[PDB]
């Protein structure tokens, strides 16, 4: 039916009314257009918002995000999925369990057929680096993810930017077709074309937070020629209009039709208006999405896999056949110090995984696709849990037998699990520092600095026993001490390193370091079997604390957006 | 007087003629506009260029770059200089030694006064992060660096992009003022405004390498309405023109006025046309520019200075008072392995210095401001030579006495100079890999991978003696073996490490490592005094070879551009 929208003097000193149809907002950049669209989006409640908001008479803060439609400037779709897997995803995540798969796919066919994308509906729509689909059709899919709920009101932020001539106008033809479907749509257009400007039925303007003329395009020309400076002479009078409308110019030139009977006419119209699944199915489904996205992207996966394979081979070649001579100790303690520390900076790529999809995270949370614990535990299942398993098991299996470490099977398991835990914990710190930022680089430098300051406090490079006591306490903040201490706990402990010297109750060699025990105690490591596993409890404790910090960052920044 | 420009059928199948005045080129992106401007720029001679080029009758390849004027899309000015230091720089580098400083500054005053920038002429025009000057005035200075030689022909690439409404039009007013000064100007405008489109006297078009209509704007409307699809109805007929002009459409719609008497008219006009300082002053002057640019930028300088100071303090605190106990060796050999390797990755920032100014390098070489050896030896004097001196001398002076290394003054000098050389050599490798690329990141990852593969072949982490012989040869490709080997040559050599054990002719401790000699030989380092300095000859040899590789990359990519 008729969908109307009302705003009484909201904040500054701006009134609003929307008929069932099509409408855009327009103005110079920094004119508050996207911030007015933040107000229209109902994304930030503690912001100063002083005025009355009526959505068909109903108040604003109650359940507005569920049925409204909102699309950001960016059109962020998963970089490897297709159209159909996208709309099956957001279809099966927005709509309830009651809708069957055939009725869901029927909605999918009416939405894709409504947009005319069936030819591309099995083409991989994520086009960052593979470039299978034109960007305007990707914009159509991004809008279609809001078409899934069949909304009444749609908000689009900058659809004209980032496209060429004809495709953006064709998108505007499909959006005019959606206006024909009985919906209200609101744009925020940077700099349009005069043809679709003629196609507009209404348009408002913004001047740095100041309300300018709302009304039709031909009546923007009419009520603007009433304000003087008549637009003629083929000067693109939408853009020439835009060039005359931009402080006594703004306040006075708006004020002279504050006095007008059109503003009092719609003010009298304003006075006339005064009289999902719980936990498991969503993390399985989102984890299915990003898990397929990792399977869909061979670049970041298989690049890291071939790096850790060939690097595992090179460490296998250099250290091949570790002898038990005098040169055994600093060679065995060499490679362990590499691997742990390798895992630590191999976690720096895990800074990327929460920062790239951040706009998709905040857009998908303001719409409410998921619960945050379901998101976080889901995405952690998707990327971190399998991809941190692979270089651990690959490293242990290809370097453990070239090097000739301990032939016992359980020691191979402790090395396996140890590289697993130190990978998850360094990656957990990378998430704990990384989550909630927009820039990868500053967090990357900050993580690199904290990993070198944890590198020094491993056992190799300082002898942790002889630090002075007023800063020897901060050993415990170092993750490769836990990794390196475990990996040289399970691997030195039976060994022996001076040929011909038994060195049990060693006599006139003192100072000799002719066991693995003497290297461990001289290094300062609890030779008791609990001293091996307290490294792992310290590890898992750092996993839980660091992921809790990232979790609290997500709950505290989820509404900031 | 009258400056004319002629092109007979150059390549594809494109003819050219320019009157004394103002002209732009226009078309869809990827239409070959900037490549046609590469042809007009005379930057790539081995490219396929088949046709006749006449500049007032004179041929093209002889000395065209000296008197022509060319500005790239970007307006790259030094990020910290002001307008006056910029134009004093390019004034004193383009013009000869014969021009006195007062006449040079008089030209500066007529050019700045010609552009109307005297109010900003002492404001810091480099506005990447400090943002002192509007970008349009920075564009005016970038054009003024071509106004220094007082050219006849000026080429401007995309002046309208990257600016707001009024400032770009005001720039076009100053450029129309330059057309009033009796010069020919050629633009390449992405998407203009109809007002300055009315201000054009002539305009050509490009369709993916195909020559479209050249002529006046009102005659673009006239000869285009002769081609059908008449432009009316306020549709921005420059942009609506642009929307109708974009394969039988291109070839046929251009071909129907290939037949026209205007194209045969200008073809009959074409048939009518058929009938510095040596070495020292320039490197002192450019080295003055970038040296002031480093003094002008406290961010990259003082950030690295406070990092190496506080990092020097922390290494001073952790290792404070190195004891000569059993734990001495792995502690002294710890910190040395840090510092060298620190310097190596502290060279990764030196990847940045030739890649950021790359567009300014190629633009400043196609104009011919300098000689390449003068550029390279100048820029190496500017950034690399002082900034690599500071963390070496700061590290040695603040960690050398906290740690309590050898009290001799010459050993302090060898450590000082050694950290200097390993900093210059790792930085030299960073230049040798870095120079000639546009992306910092891939070279950054590639440098990080080669620095870890040189990290393993230092003395600490493998015991270089017991590598198998078929890949022990590649020790010599590692830079921290040279640094670390020198720093532990001058610092272990007198020492002693087992308290109460004299260990000269050591008896029933064998295996003991109770000198600094036994650690050196057991590490595999020439205990003779030449074995200290051959590290430095290997260093300086790597400096000369790596900088030679970067030098050859600059001579081989200088004309690629």
């Amino acid at each position, epitope marked *: 039916e008729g969908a109307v929208l009302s705003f009484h003097n909201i904040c500054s000193n701006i009134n609003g009314i929307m008929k069932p149809g099509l409408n855009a907002i327009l103005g110079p950049t920094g004119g508050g257009k996207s911030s007015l669209l933040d107000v229209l989006a109902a994304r930030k409640d503690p912001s100063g918002l002083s005025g009355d908001v009526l959505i068909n008479g109903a108040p604003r803060p109650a359940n507005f995000k569920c049925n409204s439609g909102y699309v950001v400037q960016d059109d962020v779709v998963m970089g490897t999925l297709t159209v159909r897997e996208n709309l099956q995803f957001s279809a099966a995540l927005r709509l309830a369990t009651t809708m069957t798969n055939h009725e869901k796919n029927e909605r999918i066919n009416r939405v894709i057929q409504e947009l005319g994308l069936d030819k591309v509906a099995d083409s991989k729509v994520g086009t960052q680096f593979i470039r299978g689909v034109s960007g305007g059709e990707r914009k159509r899919t991004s809008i279609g993810m809001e078409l899934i709920t069949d909304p009444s009101i749609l908000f689009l932020d900058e659809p004209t930017t980032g496209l060429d001539s004809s495709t953006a106008n064709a998108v505007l033809l499909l959006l005019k077709r959606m206006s024909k479907q009985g919906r209200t749509i609101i744009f925020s257009i940077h700099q349009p074309r005069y043809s679709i400007f003629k196609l507009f039925d209404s348009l408002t303007l913004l001047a740095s937070g100041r309300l300018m003329f709302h009304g039709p395009a031909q009546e923007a020309l009419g009520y603007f020629e009433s304000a003087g400076y008549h637009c003629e002479a083929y000067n693109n009078p939408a853009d020439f209009f835009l060039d005359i409308i931009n402080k006594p110019l703004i306040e006075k030139l708006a004020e002279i039709y504050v006095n007008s009977s059109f503003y009092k006419e719609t003010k009298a119209e304003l006075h006339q208006l005064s009289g999902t699944t719980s936990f498991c199915h969503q993390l399985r489904w989102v984890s299915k999405r990003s898990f397929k996205n990792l399977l869909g992207n061979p670049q970041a996966s298989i690049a890291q896999i071939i790096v850790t394979v060939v690097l595992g081979l090179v460490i296998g070649a250099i250290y091949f056949g570790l002898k038990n001579d005098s040169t055994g100790i600093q060679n065995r303690a060499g490679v362990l110090f590499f691997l742990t520390t390798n895992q630590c900076f191999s976690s720096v790529s895990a800074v990327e995984l929460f920062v790239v999809e951040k706009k998709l995270f905040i857009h998908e949370y303001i719409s409410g696709y998921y619960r945050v614990s379901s998101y976080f535990l889901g995405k952690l299942l998707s990327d971190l849990l399998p991809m941190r398993m692979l270089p651990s098991i690959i490293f242990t299996c290809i370097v453990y037998f070239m090097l000739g470490l301990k032939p016992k099977a359980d020691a191979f398991f402790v090395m396996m699990f140890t590289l697993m835990m130190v990978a998850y914990s360094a990656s957990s710190m990378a998430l704990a520092i990384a989550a909630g930022q927009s820039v990868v680089s500053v967090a990357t430098l900050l993580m690199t600095i904290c990993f070198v300051f944890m590198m020094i406090f491993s056992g190799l490079l300082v002898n942790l026993t002889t630090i002075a006591s007023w800063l020897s306490w901060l050993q415990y903040f170092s993750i490769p001490r836990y990794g390196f201490t475990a990996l040289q706990h399970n691997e030195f402990l039976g060994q022996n390193f001076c040929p011909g010297l038994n060195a049990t109750g060693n006599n006139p060699c*003192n100072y000799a370091t002719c066991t693995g*025990e003497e290297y461990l105690v001289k290094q300062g490591i609890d030779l008791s079997p609990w001293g091996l596993w307290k490294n792992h409890v310290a590890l898992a404790c750092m996993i839980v604390i660091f992921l809790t910090i990232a979790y609290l960052k997500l709950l505290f920044l989820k509404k900031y957006s | 007087e009258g400056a004319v420009l002629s092109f007979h059928n150059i390549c594809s199948n494109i003819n050219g003629i320019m009157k004394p005045g103002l002209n732009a080129i226009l078309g869809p992106t990827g239409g070959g506009k900037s490549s046609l401007l590469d042809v007009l720029a005379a930057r790539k001679d081995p490219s396929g260029l088949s046709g006749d080029v006449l500049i007032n009758g004179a041929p093209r390849p002889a000395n065209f770059k000296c008197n022509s004027g060319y500005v790239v899309q970007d307006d790259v000015v030094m990020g910290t200089l002001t307008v006056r230091e910029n134009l004093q720089f390019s004034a004193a580098l383009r013009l000869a030694t014969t021009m006195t400083n007062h006449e040079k500054n008089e030209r500066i005053n007529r050019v700045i006064q010609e552009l109307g920038l005297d109010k900003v002429a002492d404001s810091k025009v480099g506005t990447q992060f400090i943002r002192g000057v509007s970008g349009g005035e920075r564009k005016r200075t970038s054009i003024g660096m071509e106004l220094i030689t007082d050219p006849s022909i000026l080429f401007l690439d995309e002046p309208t992009t990257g600016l707001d409404s009024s400032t770009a039009n005001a720039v076009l007013l100053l450029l129309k003022r330059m057309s009033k000064q009796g010069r020919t100007i050629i633009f390449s405008i992405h998407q203009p405004r109809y007002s300055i489109f009315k201000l054009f006297d002539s305009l050509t078009l490009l369709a993916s390498g195909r020559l479209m209509f050249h002529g006046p704007a009102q005659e673009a409307l006239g000869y285009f309405e002769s081609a059908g699809y008449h432009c009316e109805a306020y549709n921005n007929p420059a942009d609506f023109f642009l929307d109708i002009i974009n394969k039988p459409l291109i070839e046929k719609l251009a071909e129907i006025y290939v037949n026209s008497s205007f194209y045969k008219e200008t073809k009959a006009e074409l048939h009518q046309l058929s009938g510095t300082t040596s070495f020292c002053h320039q490197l002192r002057w450019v080295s003055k520019r970038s040296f002031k640019n480093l003094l002008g930028n406290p961010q990259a300088s003082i950030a690295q200075i406070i990092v190496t100071v506080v990092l020097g303090l922390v290494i001073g605190a952790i290792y404070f008072g190195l004891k000569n106990d059993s734990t001495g060796i792995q502690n002294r050999a710890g910190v040395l392995f840090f510092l060298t390797t620190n310097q190596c990755f502290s060279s990764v920032s030196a990847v940045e210095l030739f890649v950021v100014e790359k567009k300014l390098f190629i633009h400043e070489y196609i104009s011919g401001y300098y000689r390449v050896s003068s550029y390279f030896l100048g820029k190496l004097l500017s950034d690399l030579l002082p900034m690599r001196m500071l963390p070496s001398i700061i590290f040695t002076c603040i960690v050398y006495f906290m740690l309590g290394l050898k009290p001799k003054a010459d050993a302090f000098f060898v450590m000082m100079f050694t950290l200097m050389m390993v900093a210059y050599s790792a930085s030299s490798m960073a230049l040798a890999i870095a120079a000639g690329q546009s992306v910092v990141s891939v070279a950054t990852l590639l440098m990080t991978i080669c620095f870890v593969f040189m990290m393993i072949f230092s003395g600490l982490l493998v015991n270089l003696t017991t590598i198998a012989s078929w890949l022990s040869w590649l020790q010599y490709f590692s830079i921290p073996r040279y640094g670390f080997t020198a720093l532990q040559h001058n610092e272990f050599l007198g020492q002693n490490f087992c*308290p*109460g054990l004299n260990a000269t002719g050591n008896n029933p401790c064998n295996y003991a490592t109770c000198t600094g000699e036994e650690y050196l030989v057991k590490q595999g380092i020439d205990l003779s005094p030449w074995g200290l300095w051959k590290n430095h000859v290997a260093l300086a040899c790597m400096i000369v070879i790596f900088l030679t590789i970067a030098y050859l990359k600059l001579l081989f990519l200088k004309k690629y551009s």
Partner: antibody
Amino acid sequence: VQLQESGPGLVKPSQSLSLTCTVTGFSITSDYAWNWIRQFPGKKLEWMGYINFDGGTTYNPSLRGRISITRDTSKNQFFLQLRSVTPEDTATYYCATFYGAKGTLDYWGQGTSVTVSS
Amino acid sequence: IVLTQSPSSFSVSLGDRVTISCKASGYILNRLAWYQQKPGNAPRLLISGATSLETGFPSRFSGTGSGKDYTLSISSLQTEDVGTYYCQQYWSTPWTFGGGTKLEIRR
């Protein structure tokens, strides 16, 4: 090796005391590390500190700033001075000779009681 | 590292086997010497390396134990072997001794 230390049998509190352990048999700069060990009245022992053959010193970190051990190479002597004494430091004192590669304090001085008293 | 030599007294008759157990606070890894202080003398070295024995002793003395437990064991406790026995780690400076054990003769 034959060690013999000799000095005062008393010092006033908040002063310094000096002892000297004349060594016959080796040179102080030849082989071993050379050591001072107190013993509280009754039973308890406390290693104080060694200067080794190359003049570097190591002191028991309980006795920070208060002990200093010096070396006189020509007479084969090594000295302690203990600054800011206390009647706690009334103790039997010993010079003792540390092998290094055996690790154990092999030879000991015969001993002199030192009584801090007012 | 503090040693802990418990107990500090025994009263065992002549010609017997007696056992002294020095307990470290960390691992000291056979770096544990036993010293044998008489009444009125300096501590003479008895057991070096926690197993061996300095020459010039009746070889009735036997140092055993590893890990953290160490033990001097005297078979046929003679008259000369009453005294005070101080265990002493030398794994790391400072070289804390033990509290000592004053043996006694049964009456």
